[PDB]
Amino acid sequence: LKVRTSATFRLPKTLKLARAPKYASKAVPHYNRLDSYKVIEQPITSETAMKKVEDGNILVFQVSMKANKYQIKKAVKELYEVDVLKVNTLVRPNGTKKAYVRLTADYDALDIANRIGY
């Protein structure tokens, strides 16, 4: 007989095998649900928003409701080849998300805005 110093019996540890399915779950992986073109929807060109471009060096965009600040910062850099200092976001009363993107001092928001087309 074994020596049991404890009077409590516990469930023994047994081998657990990883899954080895014989057919794939879906067989076609889905493409990126949030790429750069889905994160950034369209610029906002209101009079108040345009005042922040040449004065505050800040670009204003309408973004998807599913995008966080990490994704917004990454999308702006890839689409426009600029550097982002910080991102501030809010949910508008009409159900859309607006992001205040401030570029670093090495870039001018007005030059980027003209290149985009607005």
Binding site: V3, R4, F9
Partner: protein
């Protein structure tokens, strides 16, 4: 040696913390463990009727070893041996093998064809085999209650067999079979009348036995 010291510990009540001891006697075992141990106890505390109590007697080690030695000479052919026989094929000699199967063996006993029947003592639905000693006694077929349904199965290439019988033995083994039958008959067939009148069980527990013995003495 000059730096080491002897500092015995005091393990009395109120002294140092008790050391690790073997607590296997006090282990809170799982539910399935307790029920199978208490099932054994309950069946022996009650009085066992003679029909069931006759299965407490099994063939002794010496004669059982000789019994399986003879039966191991008549193993049924395996599937591998079956394949070679089929491709060769009355081109094959008459086979000699141990008969098994509860329905098959019972029919053999009723037709006076079994020369020796082995009975397992571990059949949980005991009614399956509880009538065999009486049936063999009525038909005059010698029988032996042997220990291990797993051991009976291993000589017929099965996990369990619960019964085995020899109907026809080769000439070179006639003397060995007759020697075994005489030894087996003296233990089971010849004692059937007296065993049928004896009840089993009624054994007390270890602590209850001491209490009864103490009262008897003083």
């Amino acid at each position: 040696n000059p730096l080491t010291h002897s500092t015995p510990k005091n393990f009395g009540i109120g002294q140092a913390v008790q050391p690790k001891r073997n607590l296997s006697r006090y282990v809170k075992w799982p539910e399935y463990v307790r029920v199978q141990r208490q099932k054994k106890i309950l069946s022996i505390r009650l009085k066992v009727p003679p029909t069931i109590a006759q299965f407490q007697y099994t063939l002794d080690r010496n004669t059982a070893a000789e019994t399986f030695k003879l039966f191991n000479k008549y193993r049924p052919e395996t599937a591998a041996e079956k394949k070679e026989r089929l491709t060769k094929e009355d081109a094959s000699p008459k086979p000699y093998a141990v008969k098994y199967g509860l329905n098959h063996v019972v029919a053999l006993i009723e037709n006076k064809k079994a020369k020796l029947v082995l009975i397992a003592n571990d059949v949980d639905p005991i009614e399956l085999v509880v009538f065999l000693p009486a049936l063999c006694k009525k038909m005059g077929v010698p029988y032996a209650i042997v220990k291990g349904k797993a051991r009976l199965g291993t000589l017929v290439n099965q996990k369990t067999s619960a019964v085995a019988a020899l109907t026809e033995v080769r000439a070179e083994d006639e003397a060995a079979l007759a020697k075994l039958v005489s030894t087996i008959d003296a233990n089971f067939a010849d004692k059937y009348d007296e065993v049928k009148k004896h009840w089993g069980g009624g054994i007390l527990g270890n602590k209850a036995q001491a209490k009864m013995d103490k009262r008897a003495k003083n």
